[PDB]
Design a protein around this ligand. Structure first.
Ligand SMILES: Cc1cc(CCCCCOc2ccc(C3=NCCO3)cc2)on1
Ligand SMILES: Cc1cc(CCCCCOc2ccc(C3=NCCO3)cc2)on1
Lengths: 255, 40, 273, 236, 273, 59, 40, 57, 59, 40
């Protein structure tokens, strides 16, 4: 009586149940694991807070309306302030982590709409100015708020044009990245497990984000007659196999 | 025959002949069998 | 290898063509799941689509130019193209660039070919024979200032001398600092509020510098350098969506404003053929 | 001294030749490789992942909407969409498949075309997708369409339908750039019965459509893509 | 091997020289069936009549020309021969053509040799040294528009750079779409009422493009390109009647009107020697 | 570096010589051969088929 | 010795030494013996 | 080859970090004598610092 | 005479290449080596000897 | 393969792979053990 459909994920002191899942994706078919010695470089023993950092943090909720263009969060940024995960983050020189991402959106059998939930490794954004204008730090570190693709261009911020993925590629091809759809008629959640993907064994958690999670409405939300025209979307994310190394004074970052 | 000492100096590599699209085409956690229902 | 097996009528409870794309998988459906097929063999291996093959041919990555002329009274050799340099990079010319950016991280050895040809746009009695001396100047090395500085001694820095009209060829191991080169980097060099964003910070590999060894003849000679790059021993990770809009800058993803629709509009209906 | 003779071609530079060269950095030790998920070995590995087709090409500036094929409730017998199968041009051209095919001169193989339905769960519909092999015109009505490769799709719990365009061909390779002799057919879709919405519901519903290549597929003779060009070298 | 065996007088009921040609056979009659012969050996193998040998020597297949000159103010490089191309084909020059069309289908690898020589028809101080860059542009590739377009980057397209006066040589596998190249094709590309008829529809293999890499000197330089083609690994099917009338077009069988009698008229009688 | 000497004829192009060359299309896979009746191997095979002689050349 | 990797790059092929004119000179359905009458 | 071995807390009478430089020696002290380390390998031979290489171009 | 083809790079001088050359002094016999204390093999050997740092740079 | 007769004409030497800093880092007459007191 197991269905692909019902699932339970327990991680730390927190549990999620979905009764309307559509399997789960594990990026590149690899599950998060700690850093092996053969791959290690820094000689420091690392710190593995385990259950105090590897639990589920639910970010603040978004509201899908007929005019929504899509939202974008960066990792580990989105979690920069969650509990002890965040403290560890500002206090060590280097850290490394994988995540379980669970995006939630329920409706009824009269609604229609379909969101794309995708994880993009190394999502370098484009400046809407063109040329070689850079995208300032603050703009690519929105924190739990994430970036709202239907917000206005700002100065020093990225471009927010959806048919171009914020980088000069077409929305249609985002499907080459680990992703899952939430089609109100099928699905009510999306779950993706992200292994740590980098060109170095461990890195800085503040100067470099290693994935952007993106939720994009593709088939517009259509509510039943005289229904309220909107649904909330909630994102809950859990660091998994986290390791921190090179402890010290506590980083100070712009803004 | 390599005439040179360093590995960078050798010619192109030879075909992976690796080929396994499943990391890209089927990264699902619970295995899906073709023919069985997608969602049970 | 069979490309298609023989398959006949079906009346089952087992439907391989109905799936749920919401899952993120592309189910491996074949012609024989939905029509009646006959056996056929592949006769093919997929040899020429190997990434080593795809990135393994020489591509032009840079065209520069230097001239041989009397430096007498020149206050800025660099500025007179008495010698010139190049801030090495592989993203400046954009044919090879789109190919590499199909991947996120890439690792390979490089084979460089350098072709140099001379031009004599204004009245010369003859064509002189010039020797070029392109030398690699890595980060933190005395950058050269005149076309005949102590720098050109290049006692510790690899340099090649070849003749204009000829070609020079040599191969450099993968010089990246990390395990792969980042084709993309969503980071900064540090957490400052105004520091540049991109790879340019990451991929700063020092520059290459060219000059003519010959002193000047009576006429002036323009020498134009073309650098070709061939990846050998390629390794590529994490495929990405291909580049759709035009490029504007080395190292940023930025596209031009008021660009044009990249998807061709139908001449007719959705229903049109 | 061993006697030699040099042949025609000596001194040429062929960008496609593969030989040894001296290393400029003798004895240098590259950084160790660490493990990174996601390694690609063949472009054939990636063109099997499906991506969305902007089938609804009828707009005037690129929009998220050209990915949506609309469906109308209560129409009978009528046609949902049509397209030829020049995978290197037209709707296909910006898709990952289209985009890679363009790096090669010839292609052969089967294509997989699937449609995922997004209408309310309490609605229902039966569509017919038809592949018309080279030699006939794009079908003009379902009767015409139904006599070639087709699948009646019944919209249900299982949200997507995967149609295969089996390789139908005299010549074993076709050109990726559209060519007549080498042309591959048409793909059309019609109401089999009709879309029906539940009460309290209204308007258009949309289908999303994807394209990917079967394991069947072959691409050969690499060349340059018409999809990218430039007028001056970029700088930093 | 015996070329003739010894044979003596015959008075038989078994007549090998009477046959019925209406049958379509050529009965294998020998000297020894009708005169008295002596033994003799062949001393010969028929080596130099092998089709590999017959089609295996280089033949000139194309002569084109490009010039190096100041492109300043040229509105159409292609038109100034600032670079030129060639719509690859093997039927344009007709010596090699008659040889190939002795067969219906032919399959082979090609070895190309390209000789480039320069001419300076009007007053120059000297002869410059130019590098040519012939590059293969297959069907559906950005055709080049100026002599120095992004196209010439040729990041994915094989190109060779050699010097004028020298020769370039490389070999291309059999690139046909079918199992053999059709020397003839009695068909159309589709059943339209006005579409071209012949092979030109079939044998459209894309074109080859040449240019000089050098910028301009003070004088102008004419470079004339000659492409030679040698078949290697030849396979030929279905022999046909040799070409009798002159050729008029690449790819059609058409002969010129009011052509001249191709059979030599006797100077004398049927009875004449 | 192995010492060599080049002989007279170096650099010449003889249309009849038979040597190896680099392939411009590294790794390309040609179309499979299918069977076709009629293969010719030697011109000596075909000159044994008889054909008509315009003997009456007097026109 | 081939110095190159691809087959197209090898020199000319070597003599068929096949030679069988009968597909061209005697494509008759019922075998004709020299010396026996052509038409019986 | 290990570049660093794994080493944990220490509370000893054996102090490798106190020396007398007046002796003229450079005592071979390592990270693992004064912090807690994890194993890591060298992955490197020191090829390009050989004097033959240094004076050989 | 063995057929050859020369590749791109022929005739170049790369200051970092390592090949054989004819000896200008054929048959000459170098002075014997005697023992000398102090041989260095790697620069890695010497950067492990400590030296003083002008830390007080303020002059 | 050496093509030449004299030893000077051969290419560069090959890595010492000798490496022993103690003549430079620990030339002390009485051996010092790390961890034992420097001056007893
Ligand atoms: C990504 C990415 C990859 C690359 C290429 C890096 C190549 C390493 C440095 O390149 C050179 C170039 C020239 C020479 C040289 N030595 C003597 C003459 O030229 C040495 C290294 O650039 N960006
Ligand atoms: C019949 C028949 C047979 C042929 C010849 C076909 C040859 C294939 C394509 O030819 C070329 C030519 C040049 C190059 C080339 N690459 C780099 C420089 O020139 C490649 C393929 O043409 N018609």
């Amino acid at each position: 009586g197991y269905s692909d459909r019902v699932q339970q994920i327990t991680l730390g002191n927190s549990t999620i149940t979905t009764q309307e899942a559509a399997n789960a994706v594990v990026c590149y078919a690899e599950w998060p694991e700690y850093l092996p010695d053969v791959d290690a470089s820094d000689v420091n023993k690392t710190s593995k807070p385990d259950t105090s950092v590897c639990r589920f943090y639910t970010l603040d909720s978004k509201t899908w309306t007929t005019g929504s263009k899509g939202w974008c969060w960066k990792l580990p940024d989105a979690l920069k302030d969650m509990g002890v995960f965040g403290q560890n983050m500002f206090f060590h020189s280097l850290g490394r982590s994988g995540y379980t991402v669970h995006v939630q959106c329920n409706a009824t059998k009269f609604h229609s709409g379909c969101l794309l939930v995708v994880v993009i490794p190394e999502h370098q954004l484009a400046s809407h100015e063109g040329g070689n204008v850079s995208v300032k730090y603050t703009f690519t570190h929105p924190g739990e708020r994430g970036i709202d693709l239907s917000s206005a261009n700002e100065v020093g911020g990225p471009v927010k044009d959806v048919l171009y993925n914020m980088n000069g590629t077409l929305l249609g091809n985002l499907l080459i990245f680990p992703h899952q759809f939430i089609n109100l008629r099928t699905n009510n959640t999306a779950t993706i497990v992200i292994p740590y993907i980098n060109s170095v064994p461990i890195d800085s958690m503040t100067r470099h984000n290693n994935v952007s999670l993106m939720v994009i409405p593709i088939a517009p939300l259509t509510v039943p007659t005289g229904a309220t025209p909107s649904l909330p979307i909630t994102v809950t994310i859990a660091p998994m196999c986290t390791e921190f190394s090179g402890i010290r004074s506590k980083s100070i970052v712009p803004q | 025959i390599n005439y040179y000492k360093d590995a960078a100096s050798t010619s192109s590599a030879g075909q992976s002949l690796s080929m396994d699209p499943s990391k890209f085409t089927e990264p699902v956690k619970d295995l899906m069998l073709k023919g069985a229902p997608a969602l049970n | 290898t069979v490309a298609s097996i023989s398959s006949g009528p079906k009346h089952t409870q087992k439907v391989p063509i109905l799936t749920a794309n919401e899952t993120g998988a592309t189910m491996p459906v074949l012609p024989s799941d939905s029509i009646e097929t006959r056996t056929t063999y592949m006769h093919f291996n997929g040899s020429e689509t190997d990434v080593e093959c795809f990135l393994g041919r020489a591509a032009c990555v840079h065209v520069t130019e230097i001239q041989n002329k009397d430096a007498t009274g020149i206050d800025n050799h660099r500025e007179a193209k008495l010698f010139n340099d190049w801030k090495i990079n592989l993203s400046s010319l954009v044919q090879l660039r789109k190919k590499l950016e199909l991947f996120t991280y890439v690792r390979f050895d490089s084979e460089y070919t350098i072709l140099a040809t001379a031009s004599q746009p204004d009245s010369a009695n003859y064509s002189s024979n010039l020797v070029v001396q392109a030398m690699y100047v890595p980060p933190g090395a005395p950058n050269p200032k005149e076309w005949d500085d102590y720098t050109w001694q290049s006692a510790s820095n690899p340099s090649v001398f070849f003749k204009v009209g000829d070609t020079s060829r040599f191969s450099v191991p993968y010089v990246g600092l990390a395990s792969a080169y980042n084709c993309f980097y969503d980071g900064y060099s540090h957490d400052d509020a105004e520091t540049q964003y991109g790879i340019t910070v990451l991929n700063h590999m020092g520059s290459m510098a060219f000059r003519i060894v010959n002193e000047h003849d009576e006429h002036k000679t323009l020498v134009k350098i073309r650098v070709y790059h061939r990846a050998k021993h390629v390794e590529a990770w994490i495929p990405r969506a291909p580049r759709a809009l035009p490029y504007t800058s080395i190292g940023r993803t930025n596209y031009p404003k008021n660009t044009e629709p990249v998807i061709k509009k139908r001449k007719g209906d959705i229903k049109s053929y | 001294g061993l006697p030699t003779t040099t042949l025609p071609g000596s001194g040429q530079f062929l960008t496609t030749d593969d030989r040894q060269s001296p290393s400029a950095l003798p004895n240098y030790e590259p950084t160790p490789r660490i493990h990174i998920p996601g390694k690609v070995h063949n472009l054939l590995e990636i063109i099997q992942v499906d991506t969305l087709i902007p089938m609804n090409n009828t707009h005037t500036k690129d929009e998220v909407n050209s990915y949506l094929i609309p469906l109308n409730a209560n129409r009978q017998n009528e046609q949902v969409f049509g397209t030829n199968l020049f995978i290197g041009d037209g709707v296909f051209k910006t898709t990952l498949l289209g985009e890679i095919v363009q790096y090669y001169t010839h292609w052969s193989g089967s294509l997989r075309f699937s449609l995922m339905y997004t209408g309310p769960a309490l609605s229902s519909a039966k569509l017919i997708l038809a592949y018309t092999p080279p030699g006939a015109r794009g079908p003009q009505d379902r009767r015409e369409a139904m006599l070639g490769t087709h699948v009646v799709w019944d919209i249900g719990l299982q949200s997507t339908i995967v149609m295969t365009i089996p390789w139908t061909s005299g010549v074993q390779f076709r050109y990726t750039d559209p060519d007549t002799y080498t042309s591959a057919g048409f793909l059309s879709c019609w109401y089999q019965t009709s879309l029906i919405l539940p009460p309290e519901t209204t308007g258009q519903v949309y289908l999303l459509s994807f394209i990917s290549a079967c394991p069947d597929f072959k691409l050969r003779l690499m060349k340059d893509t018409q999809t990218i060009s430039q007028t001056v070298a970029l700088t930093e």
